[PDB]
Each structure stands twice: as C-alpha cells, then as structure tokens.
C-alpha cells in the first residue's frame, strides 16, 4: 500500500522518481496502489537514516523500505538489520554497501538482500570446477569470521559428491606477518588448482608470497572469492591476472533493474499477504522505540517470501533470506587487468560457461611456458570414441579425457560450441600411460573437416593440415 | 581341504593409525587386480596335469 525507496547521488533525481512511479504501473495492478517516496542524499549516517525511517513512518504509514547505497561499508547493512528487527519492516538490499551479506538474519527481523551466501558461492565454484574437470583441490584458508563453518560445508559437500575430489587437507594460515611459518605452510601445497578463502588485505601478502615461491605458473590456477573481488575498479598492480571470481556486480543488471525487481517482489509479497489475510499492517507508536511492549499480532512475512514469482522469474528467498536464483556472474581478470563475464547462474541454478580454457600466463613474472599443447584426433577407427556427457552432474563417470568438437548448428552457419566429450580407447589409454612419464597437460580436439584427408591443392587437410599450420 | 583357511595379513601396532589406509589400499589392489601377474610369476606351480 505504501512503499518507500532510498537512492544515492549516482544519477539524477527526477528520472529516478519517474521510473519508480512507472514501475508498479507497468503490470500486475494491485488492489491497493503503492506510492513512491524517493530521496537522493549523499549523506550516509545512522542518525540520518533513522530520521528518514521516522519520516517515512509518518509518511502515510510506509510499509516497505528500499535502501540504495554507493559506498562499500558493511556497517550500513548491520544498522539496517537492526532497524528491521526493531521495526518489523521488510527492507531489501540493493547495490552498494549493503551488497555484501555476512550477518545472520535475526529471528525477529525481516530482511532479504539481493546478495548470496558463501555456500551458494561454494557450489558455484564446484560447478565451475566440474566444468573445467579440475578434480584436484588445494584448500588454503585463514582465521576469518565464519570461515570454519564454510570449510565444514565445502568438505561435507565435496565428500558427498560423486565427482571424487582430491582428499587434500585444509592448510589454514595461523596469523598475519609471520615471514617464517608462511613458507612452511606453502611447502605442503602440492596441487594444481588452489581455492582461496582470504581477506582483501591479506590477499596482497599471500599473492606476494606466491609470486616469490613461483605459484603463479601456467599449470597453477587461482580462485578468488566475491569479497576480495568486490572492488572491480580497484585492481592493484601486484595482483596477477586470471583470478577467476563470482559476484553479481552491475555488468548486466543496473540500479534501475535492481529497484524494479525489488518493487516487483514487494508488490507480489503485499498481494500474497492481502490474499491470505485482509489486514493492513500498522507501525508502532514510535519509529523503533520501546515505550510499550514489543508485540506483533500479525503473522510475519517470512512464509510469504517462499512462493514469490515476478514476470515469470522465481525470485524468491529461503528461510535465511538468501536468493533462490541469484545472478552469480563469473568474472575473470583479463591480461590487461579487466573483468569480463564468462557465464551466468540463473538458468535453473545451473552453470554456464563460454568454453575458453587457456587464459593464464606469466603475469607476476616474465617467463613463458609451453605446458599446454593441443591434440587433434578423429573417430573413424575403433581406437577413439567420443560420447555425450551424462546429464547426472558427472563428467563421463570415470576414465575420460575432456574433448572439444565443433557441432554445426545450421546447414549454412559453421558455428560450433565447445561441447565436452568422452575419450576412451586404446590410444586414450596409451596417452594416459605416457602422462605419468611426461607429466604434461592435454588439450584434445577433433577434426572439423571430414576424414584425415590428403594434400589437396598443395594444402593438407585434417590432423596433418592442423599440425602443418 | 585346508583345516584352517587363514591368511597372512600385515602386522600393525595396537592403536596405530594405519587401519584406515592399509585395508583400503589392499581392497583397491584386489578390485583392480594387480596380483594375477605376481601370483603367476612367483608361485608358478609346475606340476599341472589334465
């Protein structure tokens, strides 16, 4: 019935107000139309926010609050959670300081941010690893708020999966500014893919130690969490490229899109509440005072945030306030220090990949390597067979090699997606046997021009032509 | 017709943390079958008649 929205000074005021007014008028006409109370102020202080909350409470009993932000401070999220707990007013989290979520939702609070928990980030990283066929893990962590339960969750997820990940133990750093035990801890790392659960400040020192120990090679890979990569525009020179990270930064959805989604979710929740109970919610005597006892006779909005669908999208929330289908775009640090989207996660909680494997080289130092060499094979003899990956979250069960094949789409277009394929046979076994003796990486491709071929017009075709060229 | 079809095993130590690895390694070797060549080139019973 009465919804207010708070915005920063990034854009203009009149256009934002007009868009917020037009939002609910697009479709889904509620029986009780919601108003718009939009304020744009650069000041971000707790007293200003509580005064604004009091004013909107006096503003025809505002029922919902939307707060935008432009900074990266996490204290504003904590104070908003406190306000929601002491006011029983649903508040949504938008881009800005409240983007990162780290505090557990209070049982008496009604808060639903647009962020995602580390557990969802953990399974997104696991799906990315499954796509990359990286079955070797290296878990290095540090004493950080809530990281122990993250380690427990990732362990109880990897051991419960049919992939069969590596049994490498967790190498947790003791304390910062050691310079003696850090090398001892890094000695125990003997893997190829390393997962990092670290802070932004300690990331610089750990990457400096890795550069000193030469852990930024072609074979080695690095995974960076969302909190470290929160400041996309802040790329220090000491960070090597290739730091794959997952976040939901404003690369595909803007502030206007986020506020549209928020107002749509609020309208759907209000409509569901009205359909369930015909009772307009009311505020307390004061903003969040305790003159009388705190009681809420009406039912909480937590059950109403389960069956929520807006414009055909199931943008609901779980019991902990986490998004059921978050964005979770994957950003990869380019060679020239830029972040680009290489996949999404909204497709029914699945993982999407652009299929670009080789993107790493000597960034921290200057030493080229040729450890990745492409291999081309055919399927005309009973020695190489390629099979489609089974749709059971497994990479061709066991005893397989990743493969690439250009599957033609139309009779005219020659565009082929890099679909992963099985690899079995006598030649595959010979290559696997040679792998131990050569300790070398493999990139397996297929011939895109019929059979092996021969010299035609003084030009070789097939595998011979690929080798020559 | 062996009276006691026992075996040899590996003599561990009481409380030694190797019962979670040695048995698994032995079972993996048995399942993958790495003892056939050993028993053919180390037992090789000559006296066989049919």
């Amino acid at each position: 019935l009465n919804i207010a929205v708070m915005l920063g000074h990034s854009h203009d005021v009149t256009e934002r107000e007009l868009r917020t007014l037009w939002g609910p008028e697009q479709a889904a006409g509620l029986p009780l139309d919601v108003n718009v109370v939009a304020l744009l102020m650069n000041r971000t202080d707790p007293k200003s926010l509580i005064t604004h909350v009091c004013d909107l409470m006096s503003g025809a009993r505002i029922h919902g609050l939307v707060f935008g932000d432009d900074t990266d401070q996490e204290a504003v999220a904590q104070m908003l959670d406190f306000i929601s707990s002491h006011t029983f007013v649903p508040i949504l989290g938008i881009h800005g300081g409240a983007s990162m979520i780290m505090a557990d939702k209070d049982p008496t609070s009604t808060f639903f941010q647009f962020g995602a928990s580390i557990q969802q980030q953990a399974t997104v990283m696991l799906k990315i690893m499954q796509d990359y066929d990286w079955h070797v893990f290296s878990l290095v962590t540090t004493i950080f708020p809530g990281y122990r339960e993250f380690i427990s969750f990732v362990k109880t997820t990897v051991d419960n999966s049919f992939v069969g990940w590596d049994m490498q133990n967790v190498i947790t750093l003791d304390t910062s500014f050691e310079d003696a035990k850090t090398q001892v801890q890094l000695k125990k790392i003997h893997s190829s893919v390393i997962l990092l659960y670290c802070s932004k400040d300690e990331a610089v020192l750990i990457l400096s130690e890795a550069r000193s120990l030469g852990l930024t090679g072609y074979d080695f890979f690095w995974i960076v969490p969302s909190l470290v990569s929160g400041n996309t525009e802040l790329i220090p020179k000491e960070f090597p490229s290739g730091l794959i990270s997952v976040s939901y930064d404003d690369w595909d959805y803007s502030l206007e899109a986020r506020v549209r989604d928020g107002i749509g979710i609020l309208t759907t929740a209000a409509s569901s509440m009205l359909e369930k109970f015909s009772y307009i919610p009311e505020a307390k005597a004061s903003c969040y005072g305790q003159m009388e006892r705190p009681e809420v006779p009406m039912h909480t909005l937590h059950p109403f945030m389960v069956n929520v669908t807006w414009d055909g999208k199931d943008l609901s929330f779980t019991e902990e306030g986490y998004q059921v289908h978050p964005r979770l775009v994957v950003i990869v640090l380019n060679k020239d220090r830029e972040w680009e989207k290489v996949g999404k996660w909204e497709n029914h909680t699945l993982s999407l990949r652009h299929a670009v494997w080789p993107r790493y080289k000597s960034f921290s130092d200057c030493e080229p390597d040729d450890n990745h060499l492409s291999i081309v094979t055919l399927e005309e003899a009973p020695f190489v067979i390629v099979e489609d990956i089974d749709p059971l979250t497994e990479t061709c069960v066991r005893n397989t090699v990743p493969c690439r094949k250009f599957v033609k789409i139309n009779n005219s277009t020659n565009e082929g997606m890099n679909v992963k394929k099985c690899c079995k046979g006598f030649c595959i076994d010979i290559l696997k046997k040679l792998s131990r003796t050569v300790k070398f990486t493999y990139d397996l491709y297929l011939v895109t021009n019929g059979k092996h071929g021969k010299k035609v017009n003084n030009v070789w075709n097939g595998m011979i032509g690929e080798v020559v060229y | 017709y062996i009276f006691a079809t026992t075996g040899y095993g590996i003599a561990l130590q009481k409380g030694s943390p190797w019962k979670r690895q040695i048995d698994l390694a032995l079972l993996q070797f048995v399942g993958d079958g790495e003892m056939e060549e050993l028993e053919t080139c180390w037992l090789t019973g000559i006296c066989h008649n049919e």
Binding site: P46, K47, S152, F162, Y288, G289 | -
Partner: protein, 475 residues
C-alpha cells in the same frame, strides 16, 4: 595527549564510582601525563533516544572506546546490538561486561566487539576437558535452534573431531515447543547415558521437567548443565545431581570495569606513539568516512597482556574474548550449590567434597550400557538363508538334518511380499541356515540378543543416484 573513553551504565551510582575509579587509575602505574577524561551515559529505555544521546555524547566528544555494561534488569533483554552497530561505522572497539551470548562471538555480525566475558565456546571447552578427565566415550548433544547453540555445537564438534570422536546423536529444539517427549525417548533409546542441555532458562526447565516423567533422574545418568540453565526456576525444578557451572569473579561488575579501564589506560599509550591518529568528527552530522586505524586498534588491544587483573593475565583469542577464564563447577547437593571443581585453566584441581550423582549413586557411572540389543538385518540368500512362511501358532515346522541333529531356527521379521508397489505387511517369517548358526554361537558366547530382520528392497545397498543427486546416501 588527551583522550576520552565512553561508558554505558545502568545507574548513576555506577557512573560516579567508575569515574572515580578511572580518575584514580589515571595516576596509578606509570602515570606519565594526563591520560583519561572519561564520560558516562545511561541505558535509556528508548532505543532512538539512546542512540542519539550516544552519538552526541561520544562521537563529538573525542572518544575511542565504549564501555557497554549489563542491562539493569536481567529478565529484560536490552540487547547491546545498537551501540556496537554504531561503533562499527568507525571500527570503534567496545568492551562488553557480561555479554555471554555467542551472538557477538562471530566477528561477521559485529566487526568491532572485544568483550572480557568468555562465550559459551569456553563452556564447551570446559565440558570437553571434563570428558577427557572422566573418560567418556558415548556422548550425545542437545542443541536448540539458536545462533549461540549452533556456535557451541560447532565448537564442540571441532574440539572433539581431533580425537577421532563424533557425537552419537544430535537433536534440535525450538524456543516454545513443549512436546519434547519424542526427542527425549529417542535420546533414551541410545547407548549413551549422558545428557547435556544448552538453551534458555524456560527451555531448560521445560525439557528437564519431562526427565522426571521419563525417569531420567535415576541412577546411571550424568547431567551436564550450563551456567545460565541452572539459575531461575531451574533450582526449584531440578533435584540433586545437577553439575552446573559458574564463573568466578564473572558477575563482579566493579572488578571487570576496573580491569577494563586499567587495560585501556595503558593501551592508549601503547597506541598513541604511531604516526597519526584518526580523530572522530566534531559531531553526529558531517562525516561519513571510516577510520583507517581500526585494525591497528584491534591488534594493539588483542596483543596486549595485563597481569594486574583480578583473574590474572589478560589475553584475547582470535575473536578478542577472554582466554583461559576461571571456571567453577557447581554441584547441586541437597538443593544447595557447593563449589568443588575450580579450574584456573588447562589444569584440574579436585576438591575433597564428594561429587554426587543422580539416583543416589556414590560412584561415577561409566555410562556404557549397550544392553546387548544388537539389531540384525538379513538378506534372503538361498544357499545360506532359507526363508519359509510360519504357521498359525507363530512357530515354523521342525525338521532334522541328514545326521538327525535338531536344526536351529530363528523367528524372522520382514515384508510379506517383495514385489514393489504392493501392500507390504510386516508378517513374521522364518529364516534359517548357515548365518543363523554362527549368530547363535555368538549369542551364547558373548551374550548377544539377536533379532533378525529382512530388507524390503532385497538389495545389499551401494551408492545410488536420485533426485538431488549431490546427496550420496546408501540404500
């Protein structure tokens, strides 16, 4: 070199006594120059007025820390969350008096919170130490659906997993549910005979009331009850045999405040020699930035050591809380509390008073009663398990082998029809063969009570793929 330290206190008497204490402390120990000009504020019941007063009287008064004390009324909550949240904007450290709740233990919710009161993780460590010194193997845990309970359970699991030991059964409670009979009987039908509770006073009372109903206060049972679960009506509703806990010099508000101010009076000098100090703004309005010296303040506070405290040396963990706190075990004897087990830290100091146990036992019960009730599951195998239907009398027909010896038979329980999608009935079958003979031999040798059961699906059971295939569960 003039600094200020804030303080939120229940009454003006505490405010003036602590002001006198800090004024005296400014001239004690080293007393190089002028140290502290403290300012005190009261716990305003109105949250908005309290927050505004705190902002005006602390942010604009050049303060570096806030001394938040316990609420005057124990029954009411008066959560110190708002002041910690306000201090978190500039990474302002805050000193907790007796906030034992594990809400502030995690730094994610409150980045800047350094309390001198040990959390319930220390209580879990004390329970682990008691288990180690008493050699308990079968241990179960009862944790309610609260953040502090989850934190305590996680701490106990982390501290116990290092000794290749895991809790046999963990159950979840709710704040208000009274039908805990199912969970209580589930705990009863277990080998472990030790029950530990960790919840609010009302939840502890309503879960211990059913203990007398289900005869859980008898002999052979050991109860591990936390510090806050013995107070209130628990003393009246709990008979003898309760092994509670208490913190020595934990409720001493004056002593805790004196220790905190003595710590800060030297911490300020240990931090003021840096290159620069980020002064707070001259008012609640005007500045929205964040101090860059917050981590430095946290490090200098956690790394500092003070042996002048009442409890001894003062050191902080990774969460900046009390380490090696002094614990006193309280034993409920004749509806009275007797101090017997006093533990300085990482050391056991037994006392001459006898430790009573529920049921009147004068000796420590081992708590290892398997009751010889080993459930047996059998798979229908023709050469080894001969399954035949039973007669109307409940016993199968008796036959003899080739040598005339009486063939033993065991009453079998399982589904009537093995076909899927059928009205399965748990009629009594009659399975006999090779395995039952050795089972009877084991029963007659090492006192086993065998009860053979069948399998509905008739499969040995391996890893299977189903809906939500990320869950690898054996069938």
């Amino acid at each position: 070199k003039i600094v200020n330290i804030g303080a939120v206190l229940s009454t003006r008497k505490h405010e003036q006594m602590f002001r006198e204490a800090v004024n005296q402390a400014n001239k004690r120990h080293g007393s190089w120059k002028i140290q502290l000009n403290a300012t005190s504020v009261t716990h305003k019941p109105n949250a908005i007025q309290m927050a505004l007063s705190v902002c005006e009287d602390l942010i604009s008064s050049q303060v570096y820390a806030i001394l938040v004390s316990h609420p005057p009324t124990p029954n009411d909550h008066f959560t110190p969350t708002p002041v910690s949240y306000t201090a978190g904007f500039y990474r302002i450290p805050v000193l907790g008096l007796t906030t034992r709740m594990s809400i502030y233990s995690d730094k994610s919710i409150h980045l800047s919170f350094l309390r001198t009161v040990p959390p319930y993780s220390h209580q879990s460590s004390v329970w682990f130490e008691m288990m180690r010194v008493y050699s308990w193997n079968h241990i179960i845990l009862l944790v309610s659906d609260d953040h502090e309970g989850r934190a305590a359970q996680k701490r106990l699991e982390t501290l116990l997993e290092e000794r290749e030991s895991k809790a046999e059964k963990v159950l979840q409670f709710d704040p208000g549910t009274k039908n805990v009979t199912a969970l209580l009987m589930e705990a009863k039908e277990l080998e472990a005979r030790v029950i530990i509770l960790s919840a609010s006073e009302d939840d502890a009372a309503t879960v211990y009331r059913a203990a007398a109903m289900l005869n859980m206060t008898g002999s052979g049972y050991v109860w591990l009850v936390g510090e806050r679960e013995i107070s209130g009506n628990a003393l009246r509703y709990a008979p003898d045999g309760i092994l509670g806990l208490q913190l020595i010099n934990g409720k001493n508000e004056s002593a805790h405040i004196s220790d905190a101010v003595g710590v800060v009076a030297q911490a300020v000098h240990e931090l003021l020699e840096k290159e620069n100090i980020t002064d707070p703004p001259r008012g609640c309005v005007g500045n929205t930035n964040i101090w860059k010296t917050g981590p430095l303040f946290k490090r200098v506070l956690m790394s500092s050591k003070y042996a002048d405290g009442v409890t001894g040396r003062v050191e902080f963990n990774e969460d900046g809380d009390r380490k090696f706190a002094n614990y006193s075990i309280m034993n409920l004897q004749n509806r009275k509390l007797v101090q017997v087990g006093i533990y300085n830290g990482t050391h056991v100091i037994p006392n001459d008073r006898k430790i009573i146990w529920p049921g009147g036992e004068t000796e420590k019960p081992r708590g290892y009663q398997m009751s010889t009730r080993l459930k047996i599951v059998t798979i229908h195998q023709e050469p080894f398990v001969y399954v035949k239907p039973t007669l109307s009398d409940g016993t199968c027909k008796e036959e003899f082998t080739v040598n005339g010896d009486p063939v033993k038979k065991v009453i079998c329980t399982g589904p009537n029809d093995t076909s899927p999608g059928s009205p399965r009935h748990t009629v009594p079958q009659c399975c006999y063969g090779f395995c039952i003979d050795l089972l009877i031999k084991l029963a007659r040798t090492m006192n086993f009570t065998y009860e053979v059961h069948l399998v509905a699906d008739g499969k040995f059971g391996t890893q299977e793929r189903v809906n939500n295939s990320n869950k690898k569960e054996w069938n």
